Amino acid sequence: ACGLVASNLNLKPGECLKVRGELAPDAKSFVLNLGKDSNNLCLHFNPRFNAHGDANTIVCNSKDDGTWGTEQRETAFPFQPGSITEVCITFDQADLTIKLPDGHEFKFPNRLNMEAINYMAADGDFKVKCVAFE
Amino acid sequence: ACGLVASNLNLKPGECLKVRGELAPDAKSFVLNLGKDSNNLCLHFNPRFNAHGDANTIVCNSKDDGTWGTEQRETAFPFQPGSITEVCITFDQADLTIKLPDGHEFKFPNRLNMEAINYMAADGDFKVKCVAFE
Ligand SMILES: OC[C@H]1O[C@@H](O[C@H]2[C@H](O)[C@@H](O)[C@@H](O)O[C@@H]2CO)[C@H](O)[C@@H](O)[C@H]1O
Ligand SMILES: OC[C@H]1O[C@@H](O[C@H]2[C@H](O)[C@@H](O)[C@@H](O)O[C@@H]2CO)[C@H](O)[C@@H](O)[C@H]1O
Numbered sequence: 001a002c003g004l005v006a007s008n009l010n011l012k013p014g015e016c017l018k019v020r021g022e023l024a025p026d027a028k029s030f031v032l033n034l035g036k037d038s039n040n041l042c043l044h045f046n047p048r049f050n051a052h053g054d055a056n057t058i059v060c061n062s063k064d065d066g067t068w069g070t071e072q073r074e075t076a077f078p079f080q081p082g083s084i085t086e087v088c089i090t091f092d093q094a095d096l097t098i099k100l101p102d103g104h105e106f107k108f109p110n111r112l113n114m115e116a117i118n119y120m121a122a123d124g125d126f127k128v129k130c131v132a133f134e
Numbered sequence: 135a136c137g138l139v140a141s142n143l144n145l146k147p148g149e150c151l152k153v154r155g156e157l158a159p160d161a162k163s164f165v166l167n168l169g170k171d172s173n174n175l176c177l178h179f180n181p182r183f184n185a186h187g188d189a190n191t192i193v194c195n196s197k198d199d200g201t202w203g204t205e206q207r208e209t210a211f212p213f214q215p216g217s218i219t220e221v222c223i224t225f226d227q228a229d230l231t232i233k234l235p236d237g238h239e240f241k242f243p244n245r246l247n248m249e250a251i252n253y254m255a256a257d258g259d260f261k262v263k264c265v266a267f268e
Contacts, residue, residue: 006140132264 001038003031003122004131011117011133013092016099020086020130021122027081030126034089034096035112035119039066042114043089043096046124047079060098062111069111078102084129091117137256140265141171145251147226150268153254154220156261161215164260168223168230168251173200176248177223177230180258181213194232196245203245212236218263225251 011017011034019032029051035041041063048054056077062069078100079085088099091114095107122128145151145168153166163185169175175197182188190211196203212234213219222233225248229241256262 002142004140004142006138008136008139128267130264130266133262 001121001123003124003126004128005038005119005121006131007037007119009118009120009133011091013115014090016134017089017117017120018086018130018132018134019089019120019122019128020084020132021126021128022084023079023081024125024127025082027079027125030124031122032087032089032126033063033119033121033123034117035063036114036117037119038121040064040112041119042091042110042112042117043098043108044068045087045089045098047077049079049081049125060108062109064112072108074106076100076102076104078104081125085126137258137260138262138265139172139253139255141253143252143254143267145225145267147249148224150222150224151251151254152220152222152264152266152268153256153262154218154264154266155256156263157213157215157217157219158259158261159216161213161259164258165256166221166223166260167197167255167257168253169197169246169248170252172253172255173197174246175253176225176244176246176251177232177242178202179221179223179232181211183213183215183259194242196242198246206242208240210234210236210238212238215259219260224268 058074168177192208
């Protein structure tokens, strides 16, 4: 965990969290983590260019008290190394919604029944350049 | 309670940190802290509408291992309760430079000789809406 870590986010349901940043020239993997704290994540958002046996695949998971849940994978991969990218995230009682920069959108279940998101962290081959709250 | 806290900022000399946010309708005081950690601050930036015996005055200080340094006060006060505001900050070996939204700029000495800013925190009657790097 070398990237930006933010706490006291107070993101509420329906409010969009917009994260923009720079993908390394030789990016292999990058991560955006959201939740209560570092061991309790409603969203581990992990686009893998080539990491852990996945190629050009977004892997999402939850983390409950340090234990990873069951993974969800997405096919579309709107990212390129050496480029800027932007992701928007919101949530409700049921799911998190991830808005991808190619205009694609997908859902990830709110397994931990989180009513507020207080923690974000960036990791991997990504440097945050802008974080915005609606 | 404290607003947004961010660590692993990796702000280098000459790089600009842009913070935009909402001032409470009845704002009395707000704070932006920058430095290494919560006890070691190269910049405590505290516009006071009416707090601690100051009226409409920006109070700046450093904090070295929990101890406040010698205060610096600025006359101009380009802030209004209930409005959005934006501050931009950079630094070099000698000083921090604070760029105010009325176009004013002033300097605060880099007393702790910080070569990198790792930590930021918002506090008081201010809700961060956007943080951007540089
Ligand atoms: O689930 C998120 C974590 O996945 C870990 O890798 C998994 C991998 O995705 C899976 O296919 C299998 O190989 O088991 C691995 C367990 O280590 C990553 O190591 C971790 O960083 C998270 O992304
Ligand atoms: O120096 C920053 C801190 O100031 C504290 O208040 C000062 C006040 O500004 C000064 O005029 C004198 O009265 O001593 C006070 C206590 O040190 C604030 O309480 C603190 O929050 C910082 O802003």
